[PDB]
Amino acid sequence: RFLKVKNWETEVVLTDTLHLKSTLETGCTEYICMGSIMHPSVATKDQLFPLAKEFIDQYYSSIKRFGSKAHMERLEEVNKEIDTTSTYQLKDTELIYGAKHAWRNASRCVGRIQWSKLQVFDARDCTTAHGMFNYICNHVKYATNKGNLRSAITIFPQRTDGKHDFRVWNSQLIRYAGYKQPDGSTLGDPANVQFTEICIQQGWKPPRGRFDVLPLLLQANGNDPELFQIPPELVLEVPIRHPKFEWFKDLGLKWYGLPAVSNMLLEIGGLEFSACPFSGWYMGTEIGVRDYCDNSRYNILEEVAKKMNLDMRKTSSLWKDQALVEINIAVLYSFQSDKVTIVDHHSATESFIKHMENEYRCRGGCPADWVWIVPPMSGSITPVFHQEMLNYRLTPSFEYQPDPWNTHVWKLV
Amino acid sequence: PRFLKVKNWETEVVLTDTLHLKSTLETGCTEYICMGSIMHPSQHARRPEDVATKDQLFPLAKEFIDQYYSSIKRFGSKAHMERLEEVNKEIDTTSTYQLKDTELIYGAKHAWRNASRCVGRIQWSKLQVFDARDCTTAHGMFNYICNHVKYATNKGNLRSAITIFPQRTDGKHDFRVWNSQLIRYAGYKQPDGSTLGDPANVQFTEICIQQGWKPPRGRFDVLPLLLQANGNDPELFQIPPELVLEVPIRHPKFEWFKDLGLKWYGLPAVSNMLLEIGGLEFSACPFSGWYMGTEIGVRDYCDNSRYNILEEVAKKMNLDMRKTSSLWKDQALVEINIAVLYSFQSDKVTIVDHHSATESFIKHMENEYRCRGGCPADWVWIVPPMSGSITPVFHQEMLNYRLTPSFEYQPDPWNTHVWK
Ligand code: HEM
Ligand code: HEM
Ligand SMILES: CNCc1cc(F)c(F)c(-c2cc(C)cc(N)n2)c1
Ligand SMILES: CNCc1cc(F)c(F)c(-c2cc(C)cc(N)n2)c1
Ligand SMILES: C[C@H](O)[C@H](O)[C@H]1CNc2nc(N)[nH]c(=O)c2N1
Ligand SMILES: C[C@H](O)[C@H](O)[C@H]1CNc2nc(N)[nH]c(=O)c2N1
Ligand SMILES: [Zn+2]
Numbered sequence A: 001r002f003l004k005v006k007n008w009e010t011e012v013v014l015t016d017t018l019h020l021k022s023t024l025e026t027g028c029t030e031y032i033c034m035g036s037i038m039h040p041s042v043a044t045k046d047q048l049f050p051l052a053k054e055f056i057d058q059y060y061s062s063i064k065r066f067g068s069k070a071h072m073e074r075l076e077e078v079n080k081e082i083d084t085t086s087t088y089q090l091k092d093t094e095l096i097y098g099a100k101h102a103w104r105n106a107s108r109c110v111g112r113i114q115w116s117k118l119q120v121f122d123a124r125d126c127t128t129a130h131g132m133f134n135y136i137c138n139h140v141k142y143a144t145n146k147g148n149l150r151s152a153i154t155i156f157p158q159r160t161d162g163k164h165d166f167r168v169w170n171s172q173l174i175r176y177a178g179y180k181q182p183d184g185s186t187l188g189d190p191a192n193v194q195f196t197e198i199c200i201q202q203g204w205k206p207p208r209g210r211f212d213v214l215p216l217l218l219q220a221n222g223n224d225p226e227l228f229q230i231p232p233e234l235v236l237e238v239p240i241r242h243p244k245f246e247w248f249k250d251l252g253l254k255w256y257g258l259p260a261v262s263n264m265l266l267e268i269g270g271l272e273f274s275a276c277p278f279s280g281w282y283m284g285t286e287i288g289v290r291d292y293c294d295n296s297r298y299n300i301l302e303e304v305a306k307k308m309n310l311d312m313r314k315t316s317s318l319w320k321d322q323a324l325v326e327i328n329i330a331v332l333y334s335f336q337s338d339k340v341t342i343v344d345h346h347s348a349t350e351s352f353i354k355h356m357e358n359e360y361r362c363r364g365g366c367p368a369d370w371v372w373i374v375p376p377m378s379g380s381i382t383p384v385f386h387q388e389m390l391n392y393r394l395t396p397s398f399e400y401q402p403d404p405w406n407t408h409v410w411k412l413v
Numbered sequence B: 001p002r003f004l005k006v007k008n009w010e011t012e013v014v015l016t017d018t019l020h021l022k023s024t025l026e027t028g029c030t031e032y033i034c035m036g037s038i039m040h041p042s043q044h045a046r047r048p049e050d051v052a053t054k055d056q057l058f059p060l061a062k063e064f065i066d067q068y069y070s071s072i073k074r075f076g077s078k079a080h081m082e083r084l085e086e087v088n089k090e091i092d093t094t095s096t097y098q099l100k101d102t103e104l105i106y107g108a109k110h111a112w113r114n115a116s117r118c119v120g121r122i123q124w125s126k127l128q129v130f131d132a133r134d135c136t137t138a139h140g141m142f143n144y145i146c147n148h149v150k151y152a153t154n155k156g157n158l159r160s161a162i163t164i165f166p167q168r169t170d171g172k173h174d175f176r177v178w179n180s181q182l183i184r185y186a187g188y189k190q191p192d193g194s195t196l197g198d199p200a201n202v203q204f205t206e207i208c209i210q211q212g213w214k215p216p217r218g219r220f221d222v223l224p225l226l227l228q229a230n231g232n233d234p235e236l237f238q239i240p241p242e243l244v245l246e247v248p249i250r251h252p253k254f255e256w257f258k259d260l261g262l263k264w265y266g267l268p269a270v271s272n273m274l275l276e277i278g279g280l281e282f283s284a285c286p287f288s289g290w291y292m293g294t295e296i297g298v299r300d301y302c303d304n305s306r307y308n309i310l311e312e313v314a315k316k317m318n319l320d321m322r323k324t325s326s327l328w329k330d331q332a333l334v335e336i337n338i339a340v341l342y343s344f345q346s347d348k349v350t351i352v353d354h355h356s357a358t359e360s361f362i363k364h365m366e367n368e369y370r371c372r373g374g375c376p377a378d379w380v381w382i383v384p385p386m387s388g389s390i391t392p393v394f395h396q397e398m399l400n401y402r403l404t405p406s407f408e409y410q411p412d413p414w415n416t417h418v419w420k
Helices: A045-062 A069-084 A092-104 A129-147 A190-202 A246-251 A284-291 A301-306 A319-337 A345-362 B054-071 B078-094 B101-113 B138-156 B199-210 B255-260 B293-302 B310-317 B328-346 B354-372
Strands: A004-006 A013-015 A119-122 A152-155 A178-180 A186-188 A216-219 A226-228 A237-239 A254-256 A265-268 A271-273 A397-399 B004-008 B013-017 B128-131 B161-164 B187-189 B195-197 B225-228 B235-237 B246-248 B263-265 B274-277 B280-282 B406-408
Touching (some): A013 A345, A045 A092, A129 A152, A129 A216, A178 A190, A237 A319, A301 A319, B013 B354, B054 B101, B101 B274, B101 B406, B138 B235, B187 B199
Antiparallel strands (some): A178 A186, A265 A271, B187 B195, B274 B406
C-alpha cells in the first residue's frame, strides 16, 4: 500500500510509504476524524522488550549496520538489562539519534528542516534540582549564543517507577508572570496566572510587573520542586518597536528571545524522559499573533488599533486584521535589529515545503499536522495551506504529559 | 465510542457529541493515520456508480424515509408504512424511486445542514428549493437556472436557493452543469506564457471557445453556461447580463484602488456537486448563498494560481518588497479584503466578513449540540484563509463525520462524457 498527497497550488504529488511504520493511535477512527482535537486518546518488562527492539533495530538500520555483529550484540545486551533491571539504558549515540528523530517526527513543527542540527546535552547523571538548574543555565547560555540562536535539548534521567520523576514545572524555560488583580483584570501574561501562583506560594517574591521572568521550578527524583532565578544576564530579551510608527515603542512591549519547551515528554525505545527541555528560535507569528493578540493572552489589539485611529465600531472594517499585521512587522523588525534570530511565517513555511519534498524523497514520508503547520494569520498566502499532509505518529516522539502539580504528592510537612 | 467531547480553548466550553453515532460512511482516517487535510480522502459511496439492484438501493431508501418520518414525529404511522411499500413497488418496477416534494426539501436542507465544510450553515432551514425534475432539455435547464439566479440575487438582497434537476438514472443520461459555479470569469492563456483572467477556468474557457463561444478576451468576461440534459451533448447559453450582479471594487481610503480595474460577482453558486438523498443522486443541483469576504479577497484575488493581484497592489501602497519580513503581502491582503467588503456593503449587496461569519458558526455549533447532540465540522475548511487565530473558530475543537443526505464531489463530466 502507498498513499498520495497533493499540493493544489503546484499540482506536485508525493507518495507516502512511511505511514506504514507507525504504531500508536492518532485519535481518528474509520468513521470520525479528530484532526482538530488538541489532546486525543510504567511499562512492565514484557511491554518493554518489543519497543526497545523496535528502536535498536531502527537505529542500526539508520547507520547501515543492520543485522551486524554490533547490532545483534546490543539487542542481547538490552534484553539483559530489561531482564535484570526491568529497564535499560541508551548509549550516548542512541540518545542523540533518538532526540533528533523525536524532533523529526514532530508533526506539529514547521521548523523540522533543521532537525539534524540538534545539540544534545546528556544530563542523565543529574540528581538534584541544583544539578538541573546548572544544566538548564548552560543550555540557555549555549542556545542563546548572544542572539544567534542554536537548537538544543537537555535530557534528564528517564522514568523509573513514576514515583521518582525529573520534571521541569515550567511550561517553557523563559516565560513571563501573570497576576490577577483585585478588580479582575490581569497584569502580565494571563496564561501563567496559575503557575505564578504556585511560584509565589513556594517562596517567590514577585516584582508584580508586566514582564517579570518567572523563576524555574524544578523537580529531581520525585522530590518537592525547588525555586531558582535564572541569572538575568542570560535571559535575552527584545524590546518591540515598529519601523513606521514612533509611538510603538511606548506600548512598552518586549519578548524573550529563546523559545524553550519544558513540559513535554521524550519517548525513545519505550523509555520516557519526563524532563527534556528543548529549544530553537522563534517564528514571527508565535509572538505577534498568538502571544500578543489572542483574547486569552496579552490581548493588545484594541490598544494598538486605538493608537492607529482605526474605526473600531464594526468588524467589517477589518481593524483587528489591519492591526495584527502591523504588530508582526514590529516583532520581526525588532528582533532583526537587535540581531536576534527569527523567521517570518513566509520564510518558515517555504522551508517546510522543501523539507517535506526532501523527506518524502529520502525517508518516504513526513507526518505533518495541517491544523498546526499553517500559520495562525495569512494562512492561504503561505504555501503549506495548499499542501495536503498525512498525519501519523512515529516513535521516538515528543509527547504531552500531565501537569506536575495535578500529580505530585508533597513531601514537606 | 460512547460520547466524544469537543472543547473551545478560548472559553473552556465543552460540548458532548453523540450525533456522530449515526455516521454511515468513511472519512478516510484510521486510528493509525489522519487524512483531515486530504481534499478527497475517501471514495466510499453508498451505492455503485450505475443503476443498482434492489437490495443495493432499497436499504438506503428505507434509511431515508425512516429518518424523514422520524424527523416529523411519526415513524410507524400509516403514511410512513404506505410510503415504504410505495418505494418497494416503485423500485420493483423502475429500479429507482421518486421523492415526494416534502421529502425532496427535507433532504436538501439536510445535505446543507450536514455539509461539514460550510461555515454558513446557521441558515440551513431557510433554503429555497426549486424542483426542476420535470426538466428535459438544456434549454429548460437554462430557463430554470435563469429564474434561480434572479430569485437568489434579489436586487442584491441575496437569498439562498437550490435548483434540483432529475436524478441520475443509469448514469449515461446524467444531467450536468459543466460550469463549476454558475457565474465565473474566463481564463485566457497568453501567447507569451502569462494568463489573462481567472487561471482556474482556463481549461473550461477552452472547452467553451472550442464549443463555439466567441470569447471577448478580457479579465472579467462572464462565462457562458454549458448545460447537459439527459446525457446529451452540452449546449452553450449566455446568461443575460442584467441578471449577473457585479460589484466594482473600490477602497474607502486609497482612492487609487478603483483603478486596479477589478470587480467581482455577487452570487456564489456552486453547480458541480452531486446531491445524494435516499440512495438517489441528483447530478445537477446548482445552489447559491452569499459570499464570505475572504473567498473573493483572500482566495480569488490573492492565491498565486488565481488572480495573484498581491504585488500589483503592494506596489500602489509603496511597500517594502525586497524581502518577506516586511509583511508586504500581509499588509496588502488586508487592504484588499477591506476594499471588497466596503464595495459590497456600499452597493447594498449581501456579504459577510470572516469575524461575523465565524462567530455565527460558533452559535450554530451550540444550537446543534443542544438539540441534535452534535454538528459535523471540517476545521481545515471552516477556519478563514486569513487571520485565523483572531477568529473564534480557530480555538474551537471540531468533530468531522459524514451524514446523509450530503453534497458529494463528482468527476468533471468532460473527463467522462461520450460525445455525440
Ligand atoms: C529551530 C527552529 C524551530 C522553529 C522555527 C520551530 C517552530 C515551531 C512552531 C512555530 C511550533 C508551533 C508551536 C505552537 O504554536 O505552540 C512548533 C511546534 C513544535 N516543535 Fe518546533 N520549532 C523549532 C525547533 C524545535 C526543536 C529543537 C524541537 C525539539 C527538540 C521542536 C519540536 C517541536 C514540537 C514537539 C512541537 C509541538 C508542540 C506541541 O505539540 O505543543 N521544535 N515548532
Ligand atoms: C448562505 C450563506 C453561505 C455562506 C456564507 C457559505 C459559506 C461557505 C464557505 C466560505 C465555504 C468554503 C468555500 C470554499 O472556500 O471553497 C463553504 C462550503 C460549502 N458550502 Fe456553504 N455557504 C453558504 C450557503 C450554502 C448553501 C445554500 C449551500 C447548499 C445548499 C452550501 C453548501 C456548501 C458545501 C457543500 C460546501 C463544501 C464546498 C466544497 O466541498 O467544495 N452553502 N460554504
Ligand atoms: C505549548 N505549545 C508548544 C509550544 C509553545 C511555545 F511557546 C513555543 F515557542 C513552542 C516552540 C518551540 C520551539 C522549540 C520553537 C518554537 N519556535 N516554538 C512550542
Ligand atoms: C469549490 N469549492 C466550493 C465553493 C466555491 C466557491 F467559489 C464558492 F463561492 C463557494 C460558496 C458557495 C456558497 C453556496 C456560498 C459561499 N459563500 N461560497 C463554494
Ligand atoms: C490541502 C488543504 O486541505 C487544501 O488546500 C484546503 C485547505 N482548506 C481549504 N478551505 C477552504 N475553505 N477552501 C479550500 O480550498 C481549502 N483548501
Ligand atoms: C482546536 C484547535 O485544534 C486548536 O485551536 C489549535 C489549532 N492549531 C494550532 N496551531 C498552533 N500552531 N498552535 C495552536 O495553539 C493551535 N491551536
Ligand atoms: Zn483525521
